[PDB]
Amino acid sequence: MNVTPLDELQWKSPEWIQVFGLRTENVLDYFAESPFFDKTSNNQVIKMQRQFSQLNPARRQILFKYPMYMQLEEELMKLDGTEYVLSSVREPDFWVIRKQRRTNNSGVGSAKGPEIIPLQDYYIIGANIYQTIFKIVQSRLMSTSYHLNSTLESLYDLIEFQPSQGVHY
Amino acid sequence: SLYPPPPPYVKFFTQSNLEKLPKYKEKKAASAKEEEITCALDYLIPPPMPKNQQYRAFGSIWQENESNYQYKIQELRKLLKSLLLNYLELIGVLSINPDMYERKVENIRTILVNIHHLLNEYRQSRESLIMLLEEQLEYKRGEIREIEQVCKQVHDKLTSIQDTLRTGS
Amino acid sequence: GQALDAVRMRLAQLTHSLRRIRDEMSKAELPQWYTLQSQLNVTLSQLVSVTSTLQHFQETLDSTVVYPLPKFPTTSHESLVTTLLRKKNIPEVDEWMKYVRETSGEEIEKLLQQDREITNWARTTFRNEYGKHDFK
Amino acid sequence: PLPTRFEVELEFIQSLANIQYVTYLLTQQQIWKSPNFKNYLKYLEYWCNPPYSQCIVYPNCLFILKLLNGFMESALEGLDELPKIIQLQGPQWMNEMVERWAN
Amino acid sequence: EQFVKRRRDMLEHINLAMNESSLALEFVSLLLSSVKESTGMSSMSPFLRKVVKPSSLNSDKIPYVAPTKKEYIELDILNKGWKLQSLNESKDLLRASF
Amino acid sequence: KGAVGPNNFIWPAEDALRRGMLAMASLHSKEL
């Protein structure tokens, strides 16, 4: 069953931006309803935990700028696994998240902190979301080769040979 | 999807249907001497205008020589005076007993709202027609008058030349 | 970065050769056939080298992660960013291999091994045929 | 309730003004290949006269369909140039629409 | 007239082929410019130089996806498919030429 | 520009067409 690749997949939510608008405060809230947000990530678990509790270079800059991002670490350091964190922000139109997974290897002999490993690239441009360059290059080259093949077969069709002259047109 | 699908009846009408439409409508008119869709060719027949002359869309309804206003003027003047007086009384309320200030605020707004109503009956398309009327009228009068001015000055120059050549004879 | 640098220089020379063959085809008069053959063969073998080198360094290209510059403004150059971002193939090639697969259309595996044995048999047969007659 | 064919055809005509909609529609092969769609486009031409023209919301599509009318004898090819050409020719086309209506 | 038509067709075809190929160079020229400015300056087009100061492409690391039977076997059998295709058009083109 | 005001655009709104009854009419085209 034909599936559109998620790298080119682009979601638009006019109702959400009309109701709430685009801001770093609710950029994760905007991302929550997208298909790219896995329901198995610990961010959703933290979300239900918060809901239950209520019912009952630029990395350091964005680190020190917002306190909710602080709360994100102090709620995310306890849970290791696939997590969604912000990468960088330039207002009022550009935001990009950092898709990384954490394995808090607390074993004896490792003086390093929890291991952070990239998984995917996500770019929020306007109200749209974008998600390999190797594929782009090979696709461009192969389409170029197809066009070249068509041109060369047409040119060879145009070619006419005679023994007494050689090849002419 | 983002783009809604084309209407369904669009695909029913081929070139053969278009060329057989005249005989089809002739037969339909002969037989006739919400429209039920008994044949695929019914849609090309122009749709009838609704008897109520109304159209509903998105929750909203839709449907001669240009082809006591003093009462409204004095009502507007007295309403403006009363609005200024009520503004003074409301700011005095804010001064002495602001706790109930809102009790007058919306009241003043009602008068302002009434002002908007007083604009609705005064609505201006005819006035725009008038102003455009005089601007092109005066422009064409200016063009005309400069035309007879220039032709008259040319004629005067010709007569002066004729007199000059007659004197040289 | 070294692998992408080599890819850059080789693709740049390939684009230069493409510009060349372009501005010698754009002339109203067609040059001699032989010059066209030389240009074709050179550019086409250069494309082969491009493919081979891109094959060699897939790991370095894959490991790299794309990210826009902090200094690069997206508000004014969003069109330029989207131009390079998009990667979907041209449609005509798409329905091209769709019709190709339509025409082509444990059983598949044993046909695959039957193709293996036909390939090996044909290779051995032509080796024998070449050995039959002295070509030196 | 179910809307009448008046409403859906009017909404289709007014949505034809969108450049994104036109680009998407022309992107698919079978939409332009099928004569049914162009037959419907020529059928839609009769809305340029009153009182039908009084019921329109955006007059720009009035030319666009007419421009789309030209597309049947100009070729698909030119789909790529559509946004650039509409952006460039918006001024004079708006001026001619104003001349057709405002005068 | 058919010669003119086919010449125009092959011109526009090669132009379409090269338009996509240019963007590959435009992307790949950024890394050296980021690493070494002076060498990288000449690589980009003047318009791209005007667009931004070039430091665009920086090295980064991502792990390789864990392998399994799922995708290589299908990748290679489908490559078998396209090369059987290429063999078919090879035979057809050779037959027409002969 | 940043405040999306309803029912006043130069061009027809995509959200207006999404909220328009033509969407469900196409969805309910079988019922037609």
Binding site: - | - | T83, K88 | - | E20, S42, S45 | -
Partner: peptide
């Protein structure tokens, strides 16, 4: 040095083929 730089071969007129589909909520 560098014999000749490459001519700008940008194609902004290219319409692109981005698939758009997950717009409905």
């Amino acid at each position: 040095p560098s014999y000749s730089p490459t001519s700008p071969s940008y194609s902004p007129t290219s319409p692109s083929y981005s698939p758009t589909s997950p717009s409905y909520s």
